[PDB]
Scaffold this active site. Structure first.
Site, PDB file in Angstrom:
ATOM      1  N   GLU A   1      -2.245  -0.825   5.679  1.00 19.13           N
ATOM      2  CA  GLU A   1      -2.440  -0.123   4.406  1.00 19.13           C
ATOM      3  C   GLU A   1      -3.744   0.645   4.467  1.00 19.13           C
ATOM      4  O   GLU A   1      -4.751   0.107   4.924  1.00 19.13           O
ATOM      5  CB  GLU A   1      -2.470  -1.108   3.234  1.00 19.13           C
ATOM      6  CG  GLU A   1      -1.183  -1.908   3.089  1.00 19.13           C
ATOM      7  CD  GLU A   1      -1.211  -2.958   1.997  1.00 19.13           C
ATOM      8  OE1 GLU A   1      -1.919  -2.774   0.980  1.00 19.13           O
ATOM      9  OE2 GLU A   1      -0.490  -3.973   2.155  1.00 19.13           O
TER      10      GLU A   1
ATOM     11  N   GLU B   1      -0.573 -10.637   2.831  1.00 16.06           N
ATOM     12  CA  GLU B   1      -1.546 -11.278   1.959  1.00 16.06           C
ATOM     13  C   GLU B   1      -1.210 -12.746   1.684  1.00 16.06           C
ATOM     14  O   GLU B   1      -0.950 -13.153   0.545  1.00 16.06           O
ATOM     15  CB  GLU B   1      -1.734 -10.454   0.674  1.00 16.06           C
ATOM     16  CG  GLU B   1      -2.419  -9.098   0.967  1.00 16.06           C
ATOM     17  CD  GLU B   1      -2.517  -8.162  -0.230  1.00 16.06           C
ATOM     18  OE1 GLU B   1      -1.565  -8.088  -1.042  1.00 16.06           O
ATOM     19  OE2 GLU B   1      -3.551  -7.469  -0.342  1.00 16.06           O
TER      20      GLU B   1
END
Ligand SMILES: [Mg+2]
Ligand code: NA
Ligand code: NA
Lengths: 210, 211
Positions: B145, B69
């Site tokens: 994820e 991220e």
């Protein structure tokens, strides 16, 4: 008097095992065609484009049969309605292709078309190409012609593109079938089929299987 | 990068490991503000290069990750290529900037759904089945994820596994996540209780999202 002996079965039948009624006979048009001794024996039309389709080159390869002569010419002219949009004239004799020369009996014409109206199922823009076989002086020997649709079909990055845009085929397979006349097709039935297809949001047809 | 014992245990017990650089700039606006900035390349480079130098001999480590991220910046491309040069034995993955950038050998989205597209501007999360076959796309897809196990959750887990088994290039994923990040606090009687965001006077906080 013509005599035609038509066989129902042949070695050709082994390649004609389509899922359909098995019929036989002279089931499409018969015609007589008169050509001059010196004639157009073949022609191919191609349309190539720049990246944004604002320019096109129509390329027309024309083949002749008969006696080769210096005075022979081919003109390919392109028409939109009654307006001539492009024209090209050349004597016969293609470019050198190998050690033995070129095709003396062939010629390729190249016509520039700016902002061509593009052909698609959405807007079937057509031009008329006229291929004239004639003398240098302009005496016509014969003319052939065809409808020309400016479009590019290509597969790029795994997509089938028409004029640079990815197609979505709303297609249907269509056999040549009439409940009364069998496998004989008429203009009225063909037109009825096309109208119904388009009215029902089809844009494509597969000639299943011939 | 984990405590060094972790990799030894994974070597010996047998678990595949994605080793990931300590780089996350999630709160930046836009997310790549630092990772696209050459002045932050030295700092980022050390987080990647020193991980590789430490962990490259562990067989359990099968994939290197550039972090998490942090959008997609030119610094990621540079460090992607650095790893590929020094260690050709392991693919490199990175999810930031849309999960299929030039800094990743593996399409590695987070929380991309099985059948449903989420066409966010710039960083869409395609259906994983759709993603594989996007024009020109050839890479394997492994979700970095998926199946966010927050509280009463993991609804639709079977849908992922059906897809993983049916599609050769859907090669699985990493559930988010293993263990609740709750902390122990004590009442007046010394009885322990599980605490989450905000229970320590911490503010702003994101409450139960740590679990
Ligand atoms: Mg069949
Ligand atoms: Na699979
Ligand atoms: Na969380």
């Amino acid at each position: 008097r013509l005599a035609v002996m038509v066989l129902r079965w042949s070695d050709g039948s082994y390649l004609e095992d389509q899922d359909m009624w098995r019929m036989s006979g002279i089931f499409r048009d018969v015609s007589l065609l008169h050509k001059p001794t010196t004639q157009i024996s073949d022609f191919h039309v191609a349309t190539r484009f720049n990246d944004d389709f604002s320019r096109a080159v129509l390329e027309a390869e024309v083949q002749m049969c008969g006696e080769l002569r210096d005075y022979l010419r081919v003109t390919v002219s392109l028409w939109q309605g009654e307006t001539q949009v492009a024209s090209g004239t050349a004597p016969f004799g293609g470019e050198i292709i190998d050690e033995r020369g070129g095709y003396a009996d062939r010629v390729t014409l190249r016509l520039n078309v700016e902002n061509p109206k593009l052909w698609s199922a959405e807007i079937p823009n057509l031009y008329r190409a006229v291929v004239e076989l004639h003398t240098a002086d302009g005496t016509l020997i014969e003319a052939e012609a065809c409808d020309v649709g400016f479009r590019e079909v290509r597969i790029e990055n795994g997509l089938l593109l028409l004029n640079g845009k990815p197609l979505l085929i709303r297609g249907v397979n269509r056999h040549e079938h009439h409940p009364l006349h069998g496998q004989v097709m008429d203009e009225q039935t063909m037109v009825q089929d096309i109208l119904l297809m388009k009215q029902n949001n089809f844009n494509a047809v597969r000639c299943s299987h011939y | 990068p984990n405590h060094p014992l972790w990799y030894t245990l994974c070597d010996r017990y047998g678990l595949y490991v994605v080793d990931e650089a300590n780089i996350e700039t999630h709160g930046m606006v836009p997310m790549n503000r630092l990772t696209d900035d050459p002045r932050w390349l030295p700092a980022m480079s050390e987080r990647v290069t020193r991980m590789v130098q430490r962990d490259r001999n562990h067989p359990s480590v099968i994939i290197w990750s550039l972090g998490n991220e942090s959008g997609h910046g030119a610094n990621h491309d540079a460090l992607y290529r650095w790893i590929k040069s020094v260690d050709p034995s392991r693919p490199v993955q990175y999810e930031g900037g849309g999960a299929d950038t030039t800094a990743t050998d593996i399409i590695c989205p987070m929380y991309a759904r099985v059948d449903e597209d989420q066409p966010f501007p710039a960083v869409p999360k395609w259906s994983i089945k759709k993603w594989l076959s996007l024009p020109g796309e050839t890479r394997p897809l492994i979700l970095c994820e998926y199946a966010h196990a927050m509280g009463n959750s993991l609804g639709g887990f079977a849908k992922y596994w059906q897809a993983f088994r049916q599609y050769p290039r859907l090669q699985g994923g990493f559930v988010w996540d293993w263990v609740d990040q709750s902390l122990i606090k004590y009442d007046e009687n010394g009885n322990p209780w599980s605490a989450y965001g905000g229970d320590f006077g911490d503010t702003p906080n994101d409450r139960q999202f740590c679990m």
